[PDB]
């Protein structure tokens, strides 16, 4: 099954894990669990702790007030491992118990029940001038020998793992999104009617987005150009909400419509990261390291409430605009399929 692991620099403490990308089912998050292998003969301190940290680190235009980069732990939980805590009488998982068999009595378990609504692992694309730690929401697992919480943990006997919380496309589709707008003009009460629709609700990354358009112009004005673009919003809400605003792909057609005429064609947008590198602040899916990752997949809020979700929330919608100007926006979902 190929479990992971990490060994403390001194080699005294090591933490095992079954997987590092924990799926989110909208309402529950898979329980982070594993084991820690410790030896009492080198652990006179008599405590081996594990710490799950849901760090949120943010940049943006704070540099002008000096390097005021800040981070706030949106969620922290701890568990005592080497001295078995009496209250943690929770049955082991298959992975934990089979690892215990593999390892013997010198390993101890742990597990964190991450609650829902915690932001998904998301990274914001750094600008070329940024060189510090990449900003965004991330998760991290700590394990350290110690004697109490107040004492600062030594790098010598600490292990740092970075996991990520991941969300996958629903097993069933939504409704075919559609949107239309009717405009009236000072010349006369004669409408300019614009419609737009997409092929399907959920689009996997890299899959083309087919936009179905229809325009009916009964006015004397001429639609000089047709602007169609797909844009990404990232709702940043730590203390008070703020809105991001960033296109990711655009097609500009010089198509027009004569007075009292109709027009209809299908376009094909396809978001991709190749040409969007320069856009600082763009949302990318959470990385496990300084690797390359696709555009941040949409986030599925828990239930219909969607109230008080911290961190970064990403969502997409495609804008159809006519340069008479008239525009309409149409939402869609952009996330990977569930791997087999």
């Amino acid at each position, epitope marked *: 099954t190929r479990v992971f692991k990490k060994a403390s620099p001194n080699g005294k403490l090591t933490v095992y894990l079954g997987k590092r990308d924990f799926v989110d089912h909208i309402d529950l998050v898979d329980p982070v669990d594993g084991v820690v292998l410790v030896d009492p003969e080198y652990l006179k301190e008599r405590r081996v702790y594990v710490t799950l940290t849901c760090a949120f680190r943010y940049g943006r235009e704070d540099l002008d007030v000096l390097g005021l980069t800040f981070r706030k732990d949106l969620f922290v939980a701890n568990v005592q491992s080497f001295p078995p805590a009496p209250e943690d009488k929770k049955p082991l998982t298959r992975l934990q118990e089979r690892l215990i068999k593999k390892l013997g009595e010198h390993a101890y378990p742990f597990t964190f029940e991450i609650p829902p609504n915690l932001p998904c692992s998301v990274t914001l694309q750094p600008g070329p001038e940024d060189t510090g730690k990449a900003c965004g929401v991330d998760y991290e697992v700590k394990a350290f020998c110690a004697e109490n919480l107040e004492e600062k943990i030594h790098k010598r006997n600490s292990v740092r793992l970075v996991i990520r919380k991941v969300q996958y496309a629903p097993e069933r589709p939504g409704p075919q999104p559609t949107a239309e707008t009717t405009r009236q003009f000072l010349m006369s009460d004669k409408p300019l009617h614009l419609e737009a629709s997409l092929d399907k609700e959920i689009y996997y990354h890299g*899959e083309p987005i087919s936009v179905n358009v229809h325009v009916t112009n009964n006015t004397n004005k001429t639609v000089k150009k047709i602007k169609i673009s797909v844009r990404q919003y990232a709702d940043i809400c730590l203390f008070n909400t703020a809105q991001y605003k960033c296109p990711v792909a655009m097609e500009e057609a010089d198509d027009t419509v004569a007075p009292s005429s109709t027009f209809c064609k299908v376009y094909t947008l396809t978001p991709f990261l190749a040409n969007n590198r320069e856009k600082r602040g763009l949302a990318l899916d959470g990385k496990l390291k300084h690797e390359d990752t696709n555009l941040a997949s949409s986030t599925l809020l828990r239930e219909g409430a969607n109230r008080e979700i911290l961190g970064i929330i990403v969502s997409y919608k495609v804008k159809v605009k006519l340069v008479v100007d008239v525009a309409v926006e149409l939402p869609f979902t952009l996330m*990977h399929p569930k791997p087999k």
Partner: antibody
Amino acid sequence: VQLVESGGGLVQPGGSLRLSCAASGFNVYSSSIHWVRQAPGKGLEWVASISSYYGYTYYADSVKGRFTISADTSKNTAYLQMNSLRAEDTAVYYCARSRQFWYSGLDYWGQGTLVTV
Amino acid sequence: SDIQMTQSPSSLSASVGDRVTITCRASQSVSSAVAWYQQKPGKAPKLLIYSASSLYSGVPSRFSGSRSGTDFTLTISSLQPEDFATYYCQQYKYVPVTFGQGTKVEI
């Protein structure tokens, strides 16, 4: 569903030839196209690759700089430009497709035009 | 860097119904990133196994993979008259993707 490949021929050393891999049934943005040759009677060797989603292009050491790979995304066909051909380059040039999210082997293959010296 | 996939045996034979195993060692730890190909004489290869254990769609169940450290194995549960071909071992954890030398199976 399949990959249609064409553009083979014969070119003496110092010549240049162009191969094309016309995809069908998937976009070059959700996929990465790899050119995987096979010398006559020898084993496979990967010679170039393109991943349009990120824009990276990778070349084998034996063809570093000599070759150039590109693909227009409007018609989702990938081209490979070979320059200064040599005798050791004679081979079949199967085109192939690797899932972009994420790599899982070259599941779809072209048909392997020829190249000769 | 280069990762020589020393595949062996470079040739073998077995009757129909006999179980056959092909071994492929990676000159460096490539994790579980290996795939196995079947190339009929003169035609384009075909993918069978990926991730060194996963069975592709369509391929018969007779093909099964396995891993042990840097040693990878492909085993055919019962060789059939249409299984005689050249099989190639491929790793894909590091670019450049490197293929084995192949093992022609003979009647």
